């Protein structure tokens, strides 16, 4: 997250870190056994770290649980990042009598202008690289379709939306992929891609979760 602020420990209790040799992607807990992330985060040997704040120091509230299944959307297109969504099943249920909790799925798609919370342990520099120890947060509005399409001609599908600032300076960044965009307590987006980070006229592009609610619920029920 570039241009954000330190969230504070467990103030984003549904945030997870996906760790496979290192932290490499975020995700969002949607019930005690399932995490939503980005399809492009797929890889072997994922451990899900819940209740995390400082990724390098165990200090309380962390739960480290191996993924048992990673189910990429059947229409994911790795060339265009269309349908960039994946569900991860935990090998054991997380304990929610705790700091950890799930995030609700959307009941409708959010509107342009709506302010959302985006969070992650990704790079905090708008050029160069610096990965933070503790979880970062950013408040950012959903941008209009037209401004999104103007920033990313030919590349924005109905399963994507832009959020952030056309003036740049504030954005998600490498290491944030798969993590949450939450708007009024609903999971509306998954960090997916962008041209660089925090650049002028290049806001973040996010998977539009409201298009996938039935796929998510059916996948959870059948796995």
């Amino acid at each position: 997250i570039v241009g954000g602020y330190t969230c504070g420990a467990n103030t984003v209790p549904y945030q997870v870190s996906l760790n496979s040799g290192y932290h490499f992607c975020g995700g969002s807990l949607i019930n005690s056994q399932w995490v939503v992330s980005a399809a492009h985060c797929y890889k072997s040997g994922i451990q899900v770290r819940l209740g995390e704040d400082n990724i390098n120091v165990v200090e309380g509230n962390e739960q480290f649980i191996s993924a048992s299944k990673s189910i990429v959307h059947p229409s994911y297109n790795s060339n265009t990042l269309n349908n960039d969504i994946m569900l991860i099943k935990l090998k054991s249920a997380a304990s929610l009598n705790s700091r950890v909790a799930s995030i609700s799925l959307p009941t409708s798609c959010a509107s342009a202008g709506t302010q959302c919370l985006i969070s992650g342990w990704g790079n905090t520099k708008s050029s160069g690289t610096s990965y933070p120890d503790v979880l970062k947060c950013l408040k950012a509005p959903i941008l209009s379709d037209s401004s999104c399409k103007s920033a990313y001609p030919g590349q924005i599908t109905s399963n994507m939306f832009c959020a952030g600032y056309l003036e740049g300076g504030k954005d998600s960044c490498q290491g944030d992929s798969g993590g949450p965009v939450v708007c009024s307590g609903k999971l509306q987006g998954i960090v997916s891609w962008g041209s660089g980070c925090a650049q002028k006229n290049k806001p973040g592009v996010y998977t539009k979760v409201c298009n996938y609610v039935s796929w998510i619920k059916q996948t959870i029920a059948s796995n």
Binding site: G175, S192, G194
Partner: peptide, 26 residues
């Protein structure tokens, strides 16, 4: 723009990035 989109992805795994870039050549 295969290589461009490999860098556009917001993960931080060198292995995933290098895999993406190599696969663009194949």
């Amino acid at each position: 723009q295969c290589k461009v989109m490999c860098y556009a992805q917001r993960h931080s795994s060198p292995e995933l990035l290098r895999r993406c870039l190599d696969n663009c050549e194949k």
